[PDB]
Design a protein around this ligand. Structure first.
Ligand SMILES: CC(=O)N[C@@H]1[C@@H](O)[C@H](O[C@@H]2O[C@H](CO)[C@@H](O[C@H]3O[C@H](CO)[C@@H](O[C@@H]4O[C@H](CO)[C@@H](O[C@@H]5O[C@H](CO)[C@@H](O[C@@H]6O[C@H](CO)[C@@H](O)[C@H](O)[C@H]6NC(C)=O)[C@H](O)[C@H]5NC(C)=O)[C@H](O)[C@H]4NC(C)=O)[C@H](O)[C@H]3NC(C)=O)[C@H](O)[C@H]2NC(C)=O)[C@@H](CO)O[C@@H]1O
Ligand SMILES: *[C@@H]1O[C@H](CO)[C@@H](O[C@H]2O[C@H](CO)[C@@H](O)[C@H](O)[C@H]2NC(C)=O)[C@H](O)[C@H]1NC(C)=O
Length: 361
């Protein structure tokens, strides 16, 4: 089983304990660590933060302690403009240019592969995304002839029924990608004025219409479209999405007035790190959707959909039972990486819980 873990560039800037650098990562925790996010300039892959070359270096030195550890660099990301990816891929010349620039870049900075986080391709992009993946893999196959270990190529894909149908030719890209990470966590949001869990495992017989917004549907659907389970990796959240209630109502369907107040460390409305949640819980009322098998908490006019050790182990058993290649955790720097926020002195509680179940039979 594979355990793919994402580490974000911008987390180094968070004040106090929220501050997190590559060296805080347990070299034996994950099988694959992915640095997010590289950038694209003059149609070439490039750094993003000013000190990336330094952090790249710090991250890849983890491989000195754990020789089996693999690292990848991800291009794209939610804030990277999709149109940008789009213009690059639609033109053979600009696409070949971006492709030819990757290997050298990775080799120099000691990465073992590239991760395409094109988010998200439109109806007019499906064909070119297939092209990008095919040609990028062909380049990696070629570059290996020089004697070095072949580079890995993965991709982060939406778990949204409509998003999948719209811009991905799953059957095609699966045969060229080493593993596909299913983003099975932003199923609900705060774009909709109602309370809901973003990463439910199962549907939940109550109030429906969605039926497609849960991990079990996404996995099954992907398997149906032609993706081998031995290449599918399921995404497990390490952050929660918050809401500001519009009424004293707390149960399913409750009215929402907008995102949640920012966390002291992550400073972003609508998002909370697991370590901020651990502090949030004190004095909060905790609940759990039995059908969906996930928890949520409420304090004041604040409502939080999150994942705890239990929900996470539960999702881990799930992918094992369906025989998937493994789990994908977003992100190591939102987990209790210091292990001084969530009680039981343990570094990376959530990611660890995943690792134990996978380590099990
Ligand atoms: C919210 C929503 O609806 N969107 C979701 C998507 O998130 C979701 O995408 C997938 O799943 C992940 C979680 O859902 C997703 O989220 C993450 O993506 C974006 C980036 O793509 C992250 O954006 C952060 O936002 C930060 C603000 O909160 C921002 O911080 C600023 O960062 C800059 C540098 O990075 C700092 O500047 C530096 O400042 C110092 C001094 O302070 C200087 O010394 C430096 O020189 C400065 N200069 C620079 C530019 O380097 C700055 O201090 C800092 N401060 C501020 C103003 O707050 C980050 O820059 C930015 N990151 C980027 C690259 O833009 C989100 O926060 C992430 N969300 C969470 C939660 O983690 C991923 O994109 C995606 N994952 C995968 C697998 O790809 C999708 C479903 O896919 O659904 C929705 O769209
Ligand atoms: C990532 O690369 C992009 C593309 O090269 C950079 O985008 C900008 O580049 C110029 C310098 O800021 C701007 O004048 C361009 O208008 C703008 N390009 C586009 C299409 O928006 C960007 O600077 C890089 N990002 C970081 C964080 O370094």
């Amino acid at each position: 089983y594979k355990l793919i873990c994402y580490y974000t560039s911008w987390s180094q800037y968070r004040e106090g304990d929220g501050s997190c650098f590559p060296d805080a990562i347990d070299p034996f925790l994950c099988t694959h660590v992915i640095y997010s996010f590289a950038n694209i300039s003059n149609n070439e892959i490039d750094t993003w933060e000013w000190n990336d070359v330094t952090l790249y270096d710090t991250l890849n030195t983890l491989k000195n302690r754990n020789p089996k550890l693999k690292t990848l660099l991800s291009v794209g990301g939610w804030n990277f403009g999709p149109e940008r990816f789009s213009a690059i891929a639609s033109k053979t010349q600009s696409r070949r240019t971006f492709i030819k620039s990757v290997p050298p870049f990775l080799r120099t900075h000691g990465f073992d592969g590239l991760d395409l986080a094109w988010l998200y391709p439109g109806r007019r992009d499906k064909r070119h995304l297939t092209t990008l993946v095919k040609e990028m893999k062909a380049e990696f196959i070629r570059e290996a002839q020089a004697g070095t270990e072949q580079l890995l190529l993965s991709a982060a894909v939406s778990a949204g029924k409509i998003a999948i149908d719209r811009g991905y030719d799953i059957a095609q890209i699966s045969r060229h990608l080493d593993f596909i990470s299913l983003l099975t966590y932003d199923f609900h949001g705060a774009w909709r004025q109602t309370v809901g869990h973003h990463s439910p495992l199962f549907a939940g017989n109550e109030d429906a219409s969605s039926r497609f917004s849960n991990a079990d549907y996404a996995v099954s659907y992907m398997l149906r479209l032609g993706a081998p389970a031995n290449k599918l990796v399921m995404g497990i959240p390490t952050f929660g999405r918050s809401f500001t209630l519009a009424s004293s109502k707390t149960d399913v369907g409750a009215p929402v007035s907008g995102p949640g107040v920012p966390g002291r460390f992550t400073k972003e409305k609508g998002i909370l790190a697991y370590y901020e949640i651990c502090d949030f819980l004190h004095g909060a009322t905790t609940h759990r959707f039995r059908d969906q098998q996930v928890p949520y908490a409420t304090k004041g006019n604040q409502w939080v959909a999150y994942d705890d050790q239990e929900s996470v182990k539960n999702k881990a058993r799930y992918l094992k039972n369906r025989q998937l290649a493994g789990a994908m955790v977003w992100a190591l720097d939102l987990d209790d990486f210091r292990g001084t926020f969530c009680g039981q002195n343990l570094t990376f509680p959530l990611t660890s819980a995943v690792k134990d179940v996978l380590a099990e039979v």
